[PDB]
Amino acid sequence: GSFVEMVDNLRGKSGQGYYVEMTVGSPPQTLNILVDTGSSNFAVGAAPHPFLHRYYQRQLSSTYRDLRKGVYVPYTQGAWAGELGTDLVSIPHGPNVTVRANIAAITESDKFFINGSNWEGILGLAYAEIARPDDSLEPFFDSLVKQTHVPNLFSLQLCGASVGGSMIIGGIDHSLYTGSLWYTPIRREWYYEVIIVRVEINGQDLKMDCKEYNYDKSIVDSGTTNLRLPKKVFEAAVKSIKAASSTEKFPDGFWLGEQLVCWQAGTTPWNIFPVISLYLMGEVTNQSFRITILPQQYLRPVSQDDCYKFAISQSSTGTVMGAVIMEGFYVVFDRARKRIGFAVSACHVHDEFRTAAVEGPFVTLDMEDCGYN
């Protein structure tokens, strides 16, 4: 393949995201940078922190330009504060280009960096609408497309478990997937927003109004571990997942993520847990497709003891299709054509009985109604 050098350019630890090496400043300073399609800021640890091995030293970068403006990004677990500037940025195992991009130097943080994640910053790949302090701050990818010939497209292959995978920038590598790629529109360019039209557990329709699957939004977000489902959706999904796996009994707190369950090394009875399908709006009127994950995706390994957290959780900002979803698939963020493609990942974790799936087409009527206004 012509994109061979970008293949296997991601690393990570389970539950702690996937990062890419980015080279910042002059002379060069390389950092591990979290790939996050669920935000739009490029920020790097820029002062010492207990959880950082390395950080950005702007004083040592001859090409740093200070924008003279603070920046603050909250999350639900905590936040970070910092200072805006521009500098030279390239990706050794990404496109063969260098751009002047906005960079937020993080000077203080609260529950941002993860002890042992090996990343030292974040690359927000969503759109300028959600960027901080405001949409006037051009995101990394907007700069890249603006300043260079790189096609307005990236693709992600996230290889679950100590993890890895590929971010192909400017195109698609056919060795990363199998079967056809199926596309869903990007409803609006802010988050990577999409429309889920049906949910099945082991083939069984969850029978909820599709409006509920997308209240108040559904997004594809590589910086979130879990499949997050709106309260009402989550409850109905838990109940149906319980009903499908009833040959085994699990404590109430397992389904809530508060309790872990461990099996003896090599014995996890994957086959007693259901497959999960999400149908996505297709590109033609009344046409949909489904993506199907295995419990190998939604049960996350956390001794000769294999422990697992149930990684479908509750949300009150809509559906977040996190690493749990992405890890079954090769995901194409076709920004040029305002759409997202899914194909079966060449690296996804399965067994001899079941494999993750991308299937279509299906007939689904009145899909334009599912989205929140």
Ligand SMILES: Cc1ccc(Nc2cc(-c3ccccc3)ncn2)cc1NS(C)(=O)=O
């Ligand atoms: C987008 C994103 C933003 C922030 C973080 N960071 C954290 C930090 C902590 C933490 C908690 C207590 C003490 C120290 C740190 N817990 C969860 N996420 C991870 C991701 N993304 S991710 C989950 O793919 O690594």
